[PDB]
Design a protein around this ligand. Structure first.
Ligand SMILES: O=C(CCCC[C@@H]1SC[C@@H]2NC(=O)N[C@@H]21)NCCc1cc([N+](=O)[O-])ccc1O
Ligand SMILES: O=C(CCCC[C@@H]1SC[C@@H]2NC(=O)N[C@@H]21)NCCc1cc([N+](=O)[O-])ccc1O
Ligand SMILES: O=C(CCCC[C@@H]1SC[C@@H]2NC(=O)N[C@@H]21)NCCc1cc([N+](=O)[O-])ccc1O
Ligand SMILES: O=C(CCCC[C@@H]1SC[C@@H]2NC(=O)N[C@@H]21)NCCc1cc([N+](=O)[O-])ccc1O
Lengths: 121, 121, 121, 121
C-alpha cells in the first residue's frame, strides 16, 4: 500500500510532513516550501486534506490545501500515491496556486498551475 | 466581509454546505455535485479546507478537497471570496479533478481542470 | 454547424477575429485583449491555430496560440465550438498564459490557467 | 540562444520536429505522441505555433497547437525555451488536452492538463 503519512520532499526542494490518515481518509500536516513568489520570509504552513478510501486502493488519490502563513495565497494539490516500478512510493501531483487579487475583475490572472513529484524523506 | 460558512450553488447546479470557520481558517462541509463522469450514483461527499486569513482581507483566498464517496477520484478547489460590485458574495474557483489510474505510466491523462462560480443558496 | 471564422468577444470583453479555416483546419487571426497583467499598452496581436477535422464534427475541437506583441508572454487557448441550447454558436475555451522568467529555476511560477467563453461579435 | 527548430523528445517518449521559425516567430512541425487515451493507432500529426519575439529574448516563450489526426481532440502546449544549468536546450511546457464532447452540458469534463519537458533528440 502507498501511504501519505510520513515525510516527503518534492522536485523543487520543498518538504512536507503528513500525520496519520484516519478511517475517513482525513489527514493534517505541515508544508515547508523551498520557493516563493513573495518578497516575504518563508514560514512553515499547515496542510489539510483527504485520501480517497473508495475500494481501499493500494494507490489512492488524494488532495490537500496548504494555508500559507506568509502570503495571502492558497495552494491546493491533488494526485495519486503510486508504488513505482522500483518499489519506491511516489506522489504524482498537480497544484493550483491561487493569488489574492484586489477586485473580481482581476480574477482572470489569479490562478497558477503546475506539477510536483514527491518522494519520501 | 466574504464568509465561506453557509450553503452555496455553482454554475453546474452543484451545491455545497460549509460549516463554521475556526480561528485558524479551517472548515469542513459536504458537497453534492450535479454532474459526474462515472456511471455510479452521485452521493453526498465531505469536503475539508482552509481559508487564508493573512491581513484580515475582506476577500480571502481559500481551498478545499472533496473526497468523493462514489468514485475513487478526488477534486480540489481553490479560489477567492469576492463581494460583487452589486454587493453579493461570489466564489470564483478553479478545480483539479484527479482520476484514479491503474499504472504510474498512465499518470499523464489523470488530471482534469475547470472553473466553478458559486453564489449563496 | 459551429464555425470559427468571424469576430468573437469573450467574458472579459476581449475581441478576436479568425480568418478562413482552410481544408487542413488551419487558421490565423488577430486578438485584442481587454485585460493585461503588464504595465504596457495593449496592442493587437496575431493568433495562429487549427481546428480538428477528424470525422468532420459539427462541434469541432480547436486550439490557437496568441503571440502577444506588448509582452514577452504567450497564451494558448483550446476548446470546442458548440451550438448551444438556444442555437447560438459559443466557443467554450480554457487557456494557459505562459510568463517569461529569467531562470529555469523559476519555471514553477510561470504558467497561469483560466477560462473564456466566446460569442459572435 | 534557445531555438525551437529541430527534433525533440519528451518525458513520455513522444517526439516532435519543428521547422524554421520565421521573422514573425511562426513555426510548424509534426508531433508523434508515444501515448494516447484513444483506441486508435497513433498517427503523426501537424503542429502550428509561434515563439514570442518581444525583446528577442535568449529564452523565449512559445505556444503551439497539435491537431491530432487520429482523434477528435486537440492539445495546446505553452512554455519557455531554456538554456538549463548544463548549457543544454530544454523546453519546459504545460499543456491542455481538449476532448470532443457530444453536448455543451459535458463541457466541464473535457479538458485535461499536464506537463512535458522536451530535450533535443
Ligand atoms: O510564494 C507564494 C506562496 C507559496 C507558494 C509555493 C508554491 S505551491 C506550488 C509549488 N510547489 C512547492 O513546493 N512550492 C511552490 N506566492 C504566491 C503569492 C503571490 C505573491 C505575489 N507577489 O509577491 O507579487 C503575486 C501573486 C501571488 O499569488
Ligand atoms: O465524476 C467524478 C466525481 C465527481 C466530480 C464532479 C466535478 S468536481 C469539478 C466539477 N464541479 C462540480 O460541481 N462538479 C464537477 N469523478 C470522475 C472519475 C472518473 C471516472 C471514470 N470512470 O467512469 O471510470 C473515468 C474518468 C474519471 O475521471
Ligand atoms: O498580460 C499579458 C498579455 C495579455 C494576456 C491576456 C489574457 S490571455 C487569457 C485571458 N483572456 C483574455 O481575453 N485576456 C486574458 N501577459 C502577462 C505576462 C506577465 C507580465 C508580468 N509583468 O511583467 O508584470 C507579470 C506576470 C505576467 O504573467
Ligand atoms: O489521446 C488523445 C490524443 C493524443 C494526446 C497525447 C497527449 S498530448 C499531452 C501529452 N503529451 C504527449 O506527448 N502526449 C500526451 N486524445 C484523447 C483524449 C480524449 C478524447 C476524447 N474525444 O475527443 O472524444 C474522449 C476522451 C479522451 O480521453
Amino acid at each position: 500500500k502507498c501511504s501519505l503519512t510520513g515525510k516527503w520532499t518534492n522536485d523543487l526542494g520543498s518538504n512536507m510532513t503528513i500525520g496519520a490518515v484516519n478511517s475517513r481518509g482525513e489527514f493534517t500536516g505541515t508544508y515547508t516550501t523551498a520557493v516563493t513568489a513573495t518578497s516575504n520570509e518563508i514560514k512553515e504552513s499547515p496542510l489539510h486534506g483527504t485520501e480517497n478510501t473508495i475500494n481501499k486502493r493500494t494507490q489512492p488519490t488524494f488532495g490537500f490545501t496548504v494555508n500559507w502563513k506568509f502570503s495571502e495565497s492558497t495552494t491546493v494539490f491533488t494526485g495519486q500515491c503510486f508504488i513505482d516500478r522500483n518499489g519506491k512510493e511516489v506522489l504524482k501531483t498537480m497544484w493550483l496556486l491561487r493569488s489574492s487579487v484586489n477586485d473580481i475583475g482581476d480574477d482572470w490572472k489569479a490562478t497558477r498551475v503546475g506539477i510536483n513529484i514527491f518522494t519520501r524523506l
